[PDB]
């Protein structure tokens with residue numbers, strides 16, 4: 001389930017890394033292949049061969065050495081040779097080297113990044129409406145681009161047999177069978193069209209259906225599709241604890257948006273149960289549920305489903321206090337205002353030091369003199385925000 005990215009430059013390495021991290025990977029750029037070891041392998045390793053303007057033989061040697069070093073410490077999973085979307089550099093030498101080191105029958109070259117305006121049509125790269133050779137990316141200063149044809153570029157440095165699969169054929173349900181056919185026939189480099197990001201999803205699904213893991217070759221688009229397909233477990237060390245008593249439509253939508261995530265757990269508070277005699281045992285249960293979510297790296301959303309409001313706010317205050325004593329969390333989000341005040345009071349707070357605001361409607365700071373110490377606390381009034389407000393709060397806590 002491990003990924004190796006071998007990129008030919010600084011920005012390519014970073015861009016691949018970012019994409020992996022965004023999809024839940026533990027990912028690092030390792031500066032010298034000589035500091036690679038088994039513990040660094042989970043989930044992704046990125047090597048920058050800094051070889052775009054190097055001699056072809058040097059580029060080849062570095063690329064192969066990166067793959068070999070990863071293999072030598074037990075790397076197993078997927079290898080992506082990150083190339084320039086605009087086809088600058090030692091493409092053929094580096095792809096051939098990576099394929100040799102990978103020791104599998106084929107490389108899938110799916111170079112497009114449609115969300116960045118790079119597509120592959122009939123084997124040629126187009127950038128924002130022009131063939132690549134009618135763009136700037138092709139006028140030196142260091143590394144000319146003499147063809148928009150991926151095959152033609154490759155052939156400057158490698159004579160490995162190639163085949164192109166154009167868009168209509170790419171989109172067929174039998175793509176994996178076609179990849180297998182070409183492999184069996186001795187084709188080594190398979191060059192695939194792409195117009196939209198879904199095409200890259202489809203190509204990676206086909207790659208995953210083969211009895212070996214092909215070498216992958218592409219730019220940000222393919223890297224993102226690979227990262228997505230790995231389905232990395234989303235977790236955070238210090239997750240948000242959210243406590244929401246708001247029954248507004250927008251609160252439901254905000255929670256629903258977070259609920260879509262695999263790293264979010266809801267603890268639902270049946271208002272009816274508050275009047276039952278076993279209320280305390282149920283609260284103990286809800287406390288346990290929240291602890292289990294938070295300690296296993298899920299954000300935890302506690303939400304309900306005159307004096308009624310006060311009964312509910314008091315209960316949520318006591319549940320929150322119970323969870324804090326039982327413990328984390330990375331942050332505390334309280335909504336609406338009645339909940340914010342009831343919870344603050346239950347935690348012994350004397351005030352709220354305001355540092356700023358998230359998403360134009362979520363004040364944040366620290367409670368003063370409370371049992372949550374310097375845990376960031378966020379509040380939101382009932383009715384405020386948009387469908388992504390709570391997602392914005394999750395991101396805030398993830399980043400700090």
Ligand SMILES: O=C([O-])[C@@H](O)[C@H](O)CO
Nearest residue numbers: 011012083084085086219
């Ligand atoms: O693929 C791209 O366009 C970028 O990663 C570029 O190669 C960075 O120099």
